[PDB]
Amino acid sequence: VGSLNCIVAVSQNMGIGKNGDLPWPPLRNEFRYFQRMTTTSSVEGKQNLVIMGKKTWFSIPEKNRPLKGRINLVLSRELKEPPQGAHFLSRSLDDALKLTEQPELANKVDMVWIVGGSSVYKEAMNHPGHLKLFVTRIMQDFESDTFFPEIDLEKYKLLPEYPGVLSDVQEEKGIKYKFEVYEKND
Numbered sequence: 399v400g401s402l403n404c405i406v407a408v409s410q411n412m413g414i415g416k417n418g419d420l421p422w423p424p425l426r427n428e429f430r431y432f433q434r435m436t437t438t439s440s441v442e443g444k445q446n447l448v449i450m451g452k453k454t455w456f457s458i459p460e461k462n463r464p465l466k467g468r469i470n471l472v473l474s475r476e477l478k479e480p481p482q483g484a485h486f487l488s489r490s491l492d493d494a495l496k497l498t499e500q501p502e503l504a505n506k507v508d509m510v511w512i513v514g515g516s517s518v519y520k521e522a523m524n525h526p527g528h529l530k531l532f533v534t535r536i537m538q539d540f541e542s543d544t545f546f547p548e549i550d551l552e553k554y555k556l557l558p559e560y561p562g563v564l565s566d567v568q569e570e571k572g573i574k575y576k577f578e579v580y581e582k583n584d
């Protein structure tokens with residue numbers, strides 16, 4: 399198992415979701431970017447694992463579920479088995495990560511990507527260790543009911559470049575946004 403990473407897109411007022419969808423209209427290349435980053439494994443013969451909350455799972459369009467070319471793991475304490483189309487089910491972030499050190503998964507998994515939502519991000523972000531955040535800054539306010547947790551800039555350094563990540567501003571449907579990578583090691 400290699401890197402642990404969170405990936406998110408967030409509005410200027412820290413919003414990530416609204417009524418079970420994104421706060422903004424669909425941004426095709428943003429979804430492409432998320433797909434490219436989470437799918438691509440820096441090793442041969444391995445796959446990345448994506449970990450997500452139950453509400454995130456059911457926010458993804460059925461036709462993109464499971465997220466293809468990745469091992470999909472859902473967090474829930476109410477479900478008794480993985481949802482239709484998912485691969486694994488865990489009861490805590492720790493268990494999901496323990497599960498990666500299993501004989502079963504140990505040698506099939508390259509990167510682990512936490513793909514949301516709020517509570518999964520917060521726990522991963524406050525836990526000691528080496529962690530990167532891939533943050534798409536959506537450069538407007540949007541009405542939101544679910545928020546990204548505070549990024550403590552004392553611990554998380556914004557990297558001045560990162561391979562395979564564009565630095566300049568993008569725009570789709572009249573909404574500008576930018577890609578950022580943060581790293582901590584504590």
Ligand SMILES: NC(=O)C1=CN([C@@H]2O[C@H](COP(=O)(O)OP(=O)(O)OC[C@H]3O[C@@H](n4cnc5c(N)ncnc54)[C@H](OP(=O)(O)O)[C@@H]3O)[C@@H](O)[C@H]2O)C=CC1
Pocket residue numbers: 405406407408413414415416417418419420450451452453454455457473474475476477488489490491513514515516517518521544
């Ligand atoms: N990048 C972005 O902009 C992203 C946006 N989104 C959007 O954000 C919102 C997601 O919402 P959010 O409410 O934060 O939901 P989550 O995806 O975190 O789902 C919450 C449910 O997941 C289970 N869960 C969460 N964490 C854990 C855990 N550590 N261990 C066991 N179970 C856990 C609980 O389910 P149970 O009650 O069954 O125990 C909880 O009720 C949606 O609107 C979605 O579209 C989602 C991802 C990224």
Ligand SMILES: Cc1c(Sc2cccc3ccccc23)sc2nc(N)nc(N)c12
Pocket residue numbers: 405406407418419420428429432454457458459512513514533534
């Ligand atoms: C899970 C996710 C997605 S998938 C998704 C998540 C929530 C609602 C969606 C609605 C339509 C299509 C896809 C949806 S896009 C995206 N972008 C970044 N930078 N980070 C993420 N974690 C996601």
